[PDB]
Design a protein around this ligand. Structure first.
Ligand SMILES: Nc1ncnc2c1ncn2[C@@H]1O[C@H](COP(=O)(O)OP(=O)(O)OC[C@H]2O[C@@H]([n+]3cccc(C(=O)O)c3)[C@H](O)[C@@H]2O)[C@@H](O)[C@H]1O
Ligand SMILES: Nc1ncnc2c1ncn2[C@@H]1O[C@H](COP(=O)(O)OP(=O)(O)OC[C@H]2O[C@@H]([n+]3cccc(C(=O)O)c3)[C@H](O)[C@@H]2O)[C@@H](O)[C@H]1O
Ligand SMILES: Nc1ncnc2c1ncn2[C@@H]1O[C@H](COP(=O)(O)OP(=O)(O)OP(=O)(O)O)[C@@H](O)[C@H]1O
Ligand SMILES: Nc1ncnc2c1ncn2[C@@H]1O[C@H](COP(=O)(O)OP(=O)(O)OP(=O)(O)O)[C@@H](O)[C@H]1O
Lengths: 649, 658, 339
């Protein structure tokens, strides 16, 4: 295979273009369109959407009904179609066209020298600044064919254009106002199989209108588990009563892939790589989406599927797509902040309800001065505060084997702190057994002690292990740190933990003295030896748990995010010496460890998991929630996929 | 309320009657029917189904077409209807009736002085000994009304009769051949809401025909989650070319509630209490049943619902129903044997797969000489045998605290046996924690009990890490149910629990099964026998009672008072009903309502509220019983932080003190 | 006339409530609901929406299938209905209810002593943290009636509740997941006449989920030219595998009227005055909205319209609504800057 190719990893490259309108002059419009389409070709784009009524200009009013204008529009269309024989992408260009008795506001789907379909606008606004019914007929419920340059081509609202060599790409087109009505044509189309929803728009600009466009294109892409590709008219449209801003944008399942400069001087394009596998994966999992389809069966099976062969470029054309290094840790500081706020409150209110139900037992927790146990202590304290419980009911324990951060924190917090040396009990145990086992004896004895103390002192044992450890099965199962009465950290991956700790510092709700210890814990604490860097395994975890992406897809993504430390963004808090870059060889190596550990070795540990709250939209690993899987399965096929598909280095 | 009333607990009493046919003489047939219906009334029955063509006789052939015969049938029907004003049950009686152009083979649904509906047979056999098309029209797709004694009453295949004061009781009727076709009218009816399916039959008898009747009545009751009430013609029918056996039977979701003597001299009835709550519960849970309905929406919403008010007797009328003392342990020896065979093989193959997947680790198991650990050791041994593994790869441990059966068994089996005294480690731990026992006081704490229980598991896990094995869990389903186990570090935890789905009441019977089969030598049998003979009930109650409650709750979700009614009918009287094999006369206790109530309170509290967090983090192991297992990944998804207040309150308000 | 009265100016006062869940204990939930409903009465609210499965708790899983739970839910419902004889607002309260073969996830529309309708959730998520199909039947395409306390009342996804003395207030109800599918029930309902769209939600909370809820409630209120009234579950729901944030919000044609504190200690309400005339005016003008209706004529005329008389308070009850002094000049500096 050809591993650096975005197309071979399930991306499809799409473009939303805003050209230079010359109102009333189709040849000029077509020349601008042709020139932008050639650019899109050069970029390896599979799709290029233009503004509403591209070929005539949207704003020319009764000029639309002039014979010479309609004649010139047809002549220009035919030239485009002919030029398109040498162009990679499907071009979606607007045109007022004659059909039966009237002119329809249409989008003309053009590919490799042929017209694939012609789609009329369904809803024609005739209110405020809009007069569309005056010149143009509604397309809703038109079917059949239309005659364009000596061919009969599909015509109507019910069309789907499907790439026969790229099944994740199924195109539907609507027009401007179409997406603003309670039941848009695009929403039935997605149910029928459309994955990429195009919109050609005129859209005179107005205070707050760009927000309206966004609210609707974004919600559409989210509700319809689709890419939404949008292109509005700019410079050149008539300013007799209106102004135009040239806005273009591309959305994917709620997320902005790209957008262009508003009120540009000159033409602009948004170009992005859409992840069809992401959309595929979201739909596979959200059954209620298919349920909705079945419920509108007749509405949804009546669409007509026009096939074409894209034949996209096979080689390296980069990845026009932002890939976060930390799926669980947003690089944008406003967002990271929001996430931390939510994580923390989730953890706390999860624990509060447990305590309420147990009529407020004491909280037993082993504190080692490590990141996980520190954060848990803080979570426990806040829980107890919010529930009006004395902090002295939290029973913290240092359990030395064979750090001072731990006693310092407990003391600053004002919980009950205690030390218990497990060493002698360990020796006694090691000897009685005739002695990994030696590490497990200590790990087990810690949990054993904590559970017995909890029995004795009327408390529950707080679990401490994080989601990343659950994922790799990095924990001692049974009698060991895997086991507890309630685990507040179970849904928090390791990459996010350090950020919650800062959040709690930065907010400063626990005094200045507490913050200093916490700061110390951080500075001191920053395993990865045998299971690899958690930044890489948390990356893989998100891809697998959310999308079920195959290993080579995960390696491609991780490599685009991580191979170059100067590229992309780092969340806040990474001084310049903590900004590693990973080679493909490293990413491959750790991925092998990951799939082996995650699919095969580690499930039985998750299988018997104490209670605790889901935190990340990426998923948690509860066998009672997000991850139902066998404890007795090999990972052969994943390892084999990495062998066959991911280059050695 | 009125606790000893079967109606107030959701039962409906149904009857399948076989009368005395007098062919060609409707007055006589009606007199027989009237007499049987009065008996049914006396019995508090809500329903009485008679044989096909009751009023004329099924076998009279072209005599069905005679005006005087048809006129007499009508006259007789109207007298029944009038007599029925004083009768409790809905009577379903057969009659050849004129409608439009022809006579239809009908069942006339009759209640408290009115005709509720008339239902024509849908499929009329005209082959081998059957000539029904010659005299009678098919009913399939007839609708509308028909005129019976100056009233227009519903007519057709699409009727449902619903008790307005007893919503679990929704009656559908079909006729004989109707239940034998690939898509019977009764199957669309059950989808539409019918819960009790009636069948009036003529059914000349033939070698092997009673089996056919049962195969189809039983499978119908099972596939349609319903009661199926069936009545065939008997003595009196013409023996010109045929004989008749008078068979009657009542099925409920695949189970025979009642049947009557074949070839009786005289009339016979099958009378049984149908549990509408059981049918309700099965349907609530099997969503694919509702799914089937929605897929045949148009077919299923077109039924017409005729209402009637039953107004059943409110008092004590007994319970015409067999209630097993041991929902998990069948009293019938053939059946118990089948169950044991299956339980055992399930346990074993469950463990074999785990071992295969772990590339054959050693098996570490704590053996205390108790029932659970004994049975597990056996299970382990068989697993190893079938996988061609040396028995010396099973590592059994006695773990004495502060029995010889245990070392005897391990030794006879030939596994690796070893003792480890956990007492010193325990002392060291009790002292390290500052427990009063370490300075002398006899504080037989729970902490003190848990230190030992915990240390056992801790040891076993460490040995497992050391010696390359997995720890076999040992706790049984009944202990999972009551949260009777030490959670976390303790006997609740393990790498694979083969006993997790086996309730305690069944364990002793698996041990005998293994003895009785004798596949492990005579020496092994003797120790096992010893374990039995040699082998807490005081804090959680008798497991026979808690296992009974467990089944009701886990399978059906029945409310506490319903469970108490059932347990009391099963258990209050030791001479009543049957005991599985293996209960000598002094192990046959009876329980009072006061006891059953008392333990039920303990059960709902422990099961709905306290114990769930223990189940919530449960090691892998196989489901065994059709009653269910308690894996939070399978049969039982519930909250760890919920109170049982409403169940306790229901017991207070509904179940008498004693 | 009576000029200082919000109702006489075309407003209708609506409330989205988050109560205290006591899982498995319907009497307790109902007591909390009753108490919040009385508050809403006192505020002159016409409408009070509660969280999904209010009476039982959304999170109780197979406990939904327990007879004693379902029995208690019914008893509790009947007491609310009876208490509601003296309450001004239409209460919309969640309840698992038995119908035909199964239990449906329902919202019970209650008003002045009677049940107006019962609406089942249409889309039951069974993925990730959701297992709803295990215990509950889909409501899409259910019609007819259901028996609640000796009455046969409208049942199904196709219901509209219309105030006969306040025509700008036409209520439709959906549930949680209903609003997340490409073609939600609420969108057809708005085309059919619904102006106020209620949503009862359980909605375990998760990083970024509150954004999702907003994106979809806000876009719905905008695309459907309607108020969208939304109430999620809070404290008391089981934290076996999930946490809850108690979020409540009220949208109007894309604009946030009100919202409540996330992860509150105690119960919270969003209360706002919805301008029915504003909705009325937007619809009069955007012909393409009616055009959409006509295009789905058969879909949209099949709704059933249940009438009730609100009889709202006639006097001065203030105006629970922010009115900018400068319709053309936003007071929020970020926004004014954008403009
Ligand atoms: N598929 C399966 N089904 C049922 N049981 C299975 C099993 N696979 C192994 N087992 C059993 O499980 C045991 C192996 O698992 P386990 O006992 O947990 O031990 P294991 O994962 O092999 O070792 C734990 C490792 O994690 C490290 N550790 C320890 C403590 C804390 C942390 C931390 O960072 O928080 C890390 C420590 O360095 C140690 O090397 C064996 O007894 C094996 O027989
Ligand atoms: N909802 C919840 N979520 C998280 N944690 C919860 C909890 N509820 C209690 N806990 C905690 O769990 C602990 C209570 O459970 P646990 O530690 O197991 O102990 P617990 O259930 O209090 O006692 C176990 C009892 O079972 C009997 N037992 C034990 C072992 C074996 C056998 C046998 O013969 O089969 C019988 C023994 O007599 C003992 O009294 C306490 O620390 C409590 O605070
Ligand atoms: N010395 C200790 N004293 C008290 N508790 C401990 C001690 N060591 C481990 N624990 C308990 O067991 C858990 C797991 O141990 P582990 O050594 O993985 O934790 P850590 O020190 O937070 O991380 P790391 O090993 O990566 O520095 C801890 O979070 C803590 O609750
Ligand atoms: N003395 C013991 N020696 C070895 N293992 C033990 C011992 N006591 C308990 N165990 C282990 O822990 C499990 C639970 O112990 P428990 O004493 O409850 O079992 P039991 O004796 O079968 O039960 P019961 O006391 O009700 O007969 C045992 O089945 C076994 O795995």
């Amino acid at each position: 295979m050809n591993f650096y190719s975005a197309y071979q990893h399930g991306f499809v490259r799409v473009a939303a273009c805003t050209h230079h309108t010359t109102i009333g002059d189709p040849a000029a419009n077509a020349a601008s369109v042709l020139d932008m389409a050639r650019a899109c070709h050069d970029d390896g784009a599979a799709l290029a959407v233009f503004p509403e009524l591209t070929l005539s200009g949207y704003s020319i009013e009764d000029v639309l009904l002039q014979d010479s204008l309609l004649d010139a529009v047809e002549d220009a269309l035919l030239d485009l179609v002919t030029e398109s024989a040498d162009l990679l992408p499907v071009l979606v260009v607007g045109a007022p066209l004659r059909h039966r008795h009237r002119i329809y506001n249409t989008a003309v789907v053009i590919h490799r020298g042929a017209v694939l379909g012609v789609v009329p606008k369904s809803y024609l606004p005739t209110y405020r600044e809009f007069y569309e019914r005056r010149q143009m007929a509604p397309g809703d419920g038109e079917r059949g064919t239309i005659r364009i340059g000596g061919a009969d081509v599909a015509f109507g609202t019910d069309l789907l254009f499907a790439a026969s060599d790229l099944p994740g790409f199924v195109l539907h087109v609507e027009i401007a106002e179409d997406m603003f009505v309670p039941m848009p044509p695009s929403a039935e189309a997605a149910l029928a199989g459309a994955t990429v929803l195009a919109n050609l728009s005129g859209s005179p600009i107005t205070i707050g209108r760009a927000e309206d466009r966004r609210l609707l294109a974004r919600s559409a892409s989210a509700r319809c588990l689709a890419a939404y590709v949008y292109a509005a008219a700019g410079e050149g449209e008539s300013t007799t009563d209106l102004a135009w801003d040239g806005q273009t944008m591309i959305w994917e399942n709620g997320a902005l892939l790209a957008e262009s400069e508003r009120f540009p001087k000159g033409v602009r394009r948004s170009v992005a790589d859409v992840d069809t596998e992401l959309l595929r994966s979201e739909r596979l999992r959200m059954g209620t989406f298919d349920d909705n389809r079945r419920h509108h069966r007749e509405l949804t099976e009546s669409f007509r599927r026009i096939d074409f062969a894209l034949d996209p470029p096979a080689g390296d054309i980069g990845l026009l797509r932002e890939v976060e290094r930390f799926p669980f840790v947003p690089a944008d500081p406003q967002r990271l902040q929001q996430d931390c706020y939510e994580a923390y409150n989730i953890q706390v209110s999860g624990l509060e309800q447990r305590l309420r139900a147990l009529d407020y037992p004491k909280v037993v927790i082993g504190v080692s001065g490590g990141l996980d146990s520190t954060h848990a202590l803080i979570v426990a304290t806040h829980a107890m505060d919010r529930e009006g419980r004395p902090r002295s009911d939290i029973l913290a324990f240092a359990l030395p084997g064979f750090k001072n951060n731990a006693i310092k924190l407990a003391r600053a917090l004002g919980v009950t702190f205690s030390e218990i040396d497990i060493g002698d009990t360990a020796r006694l145990m090691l000897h009685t057994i005739g002695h990994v086992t030696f590490e497990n004896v200590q790990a087990g004895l810690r949990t054993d002690y904590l559970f017995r103390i909890a029995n004795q002192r009327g408390g529950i044992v707080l679990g401490t292990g994080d989601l990343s450890e659950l994922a790799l099965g990095w924990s001692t199962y049974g009698v060991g740190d895997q086991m507890s009465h309630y685990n507040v950290n179970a849904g928090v991956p390791k990459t996010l933990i350090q950020h919650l700790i800062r959040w709690v510092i930065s907010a400063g709700e626990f005094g200045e003295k507490v913050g200093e210890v916490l700061q110390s814990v951080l500075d001191t604490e920053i395993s990865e030896a045998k299971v690899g860097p958690f930044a890489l395994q948390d990356f893989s975890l998100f891809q697998v748990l959310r999308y079920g992406f195959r290993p080579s897809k995960i390696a491609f993504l991780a490599w685009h995010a991580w191979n170059d430390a100067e590229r992309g963004n780092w969340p806040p808090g990474f001084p310049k010496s903590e900004r590693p870059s990973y080679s493909l060889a490293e990413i491959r190596h750790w991925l092998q460890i990951f799939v082996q550990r995650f699919y095969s070795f580690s499930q039985f540990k998750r299988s018997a998991l104490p209670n605790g709250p889901k935190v990340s939209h990426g998923g948690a690993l509860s066998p009672r929630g997000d991850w139902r899987a066998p404890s007795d399965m090999s990972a052969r096929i994943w390892l084999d996929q990495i062998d066959r598909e991911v280059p050695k280095g």
